[PDB]
């Protein structure tokens, strides 16, 4: 009937209006959207995560923070000792210098214990040794030899790096060495060093100012 | 018949019809969302947006660029003296180096002026330092010694690195050392060496060639 | 007729109830949208993005992978000696040491041929030298004198790094050296030694141990 009409409808336009605040608008959604970013060509302005661990391997993001902490990670390990250390034989014997100090990057396995340097992670690194050979007490020989390799008892691979010499150990001299020199990871590497020397009597010869470092190169 | 009941149900289906209109659909929406949007947890595409500054340490994205600015930065500073400088005296004096030229990374503070060195930031730092001692007129000496220390203004520090002594300066000796050191802002380091040498006579030794390079570890 | 408004009703509420099946719901898209990463206030609890290459320097994001190689890219290069060679004249003979093993980095134009470093990319390099001369057999001369210096092919900059000397060169002498030092894309680039001894008799000069490298710093 009339009345009928009226009644269905005025149902169907309060659905209408229902309808009207229920959904979202043209416009609405598009401003919502571009408030966004798209997933391809992203664009953004402060934007920031939680840094991931530095021996995070992955195709994760690295925050400025994340950078700072792994070029300072480099550096891989560090030993030196403070004073004089005694040598047992100077006739070509293999000896091992001692740190009283040293320090590792962390994370990586890394780690220096009983003058060793614990090889956290295989790869190429950069090894800086510099000491210092000299003779006290009695008279000083009359030949010096001194060579500088990265020994390892047991295996006796000694990576030839420097053979200081000369005739007037009586107040020492300083090697240096820098180069390239991979290892593998697990490794318990020493730093080796032998000394020859011909002539003199009642003398001693002394390693001090030992430094050996390490850096981190893939 | 009826009349103004069907016009307002017609004028209701006209109103519903732009209400659809203008409006957000699903489908268009999830397109949108999924396909051409970025979740929280998503996986992105080699997408850009701002390069953060250096100095920053917040949890902010880093851009290759910026990978490369900081690695880049990781110099810090370095000095050179060109040509040849005269020792003072020979008698162990503290003798503070001079240098011609000089360069520092920019963003930090880090500075090298009247020949000493400033803390950029604080913290630890690789120092490489070769120098070369020559003499030059009178007799050589029977004696030549030189030491080399990082001193720090205002103290003469003898932070002692490396003492070469050998009997032939007729011609040049060069020293180079290669160490890690620890130093805070606002520290003052200028290379101080002191050196001695005796015998011959009317001779000059000649500091020449000084390098003093640091490079930034941790 | 009431079927005929009950027909244009039923037409009405086809159109009505597709639209409010098919459509997007406020609560729901709000929900999603709160899903979704807001561009301006970005913080998300991960994200990926395929590694982007080494050489990049846009404002591209950067991956874990890409601050690891492009730290480990930064070697540069390097050469290694393997075994002994003689030198061949003691009288300042400008000569350049070959070498039997080298790398470089790949991406960047290096390239290490004819025992000559090319430059593959203009910057900022720290160079690493590590040579040994040695007098062998007969008598070792009464003094000794090797220069050495980064020569450049097509513009002769031997540039003077250290001089070795000795009066009993009959064991060896290594002054490796190390500093900074720039240089101009596709610079091709060699080391070159001059060597001159004085005195002694029947005695043949071994070089030995020849490593060269360098890495591109800031």
Do not use: C, M
């Not at 034989?89 to 340097?117: E, I, K």
């Not at 300083?174 to 020859?196: A, D, K």
């Not at 020397?197 to 981190?216: M, P």
Request: glycine share 10%; hydrophobic share 35%.
């Amino acid at each position: 009937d009339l009345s009928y009409v009226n009644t269905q409808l005025s149902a169907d336009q309060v659905v209408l209006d229902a309808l009207s605040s229920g959904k979202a608008d043209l416009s609405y959604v598009n401003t919502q959207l571009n408030s966004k970013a798209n997933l391809n060509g992203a664009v953004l302005v402060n934007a920031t995560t939680a840094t991931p661990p530095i021996s995070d391997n992955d195709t994760s993001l690295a925050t400025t923070q994340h950078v700072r902490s792994f070029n300072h990670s480099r550096l891989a390990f560090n030993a030196f000792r403070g004073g004089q250390q005694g040598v047992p034989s100077l006739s070509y014997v293999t000896t091992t210098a001692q740190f009283n100090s040293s320090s590792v990057r962390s994370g990586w396995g890394d780690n220096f214990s009983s003058n060793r340097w614990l090889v956290g992670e295989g790869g190429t690194y950069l090894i800086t040794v510099t000491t210092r050979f000299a003779t006290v007490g009695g008279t000083p020989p009359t030949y010096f030899d001194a060579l500088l390799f990265v020994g390892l008892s047991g295996s006796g691979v000694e990576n030839f790096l420097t053979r200081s010499q000369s005739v007037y150990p009586s107040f020492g001299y300083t090697l240096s060495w820098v180069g390239i020199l991979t290892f593998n990871t697990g490794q318990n590497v020493f730093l080796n060093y032998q000394v020859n020397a011909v002539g003199g009597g009642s003398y001693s010869v002394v390693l001090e100012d030992v430094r050996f470092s390490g850096i981190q190169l893939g």
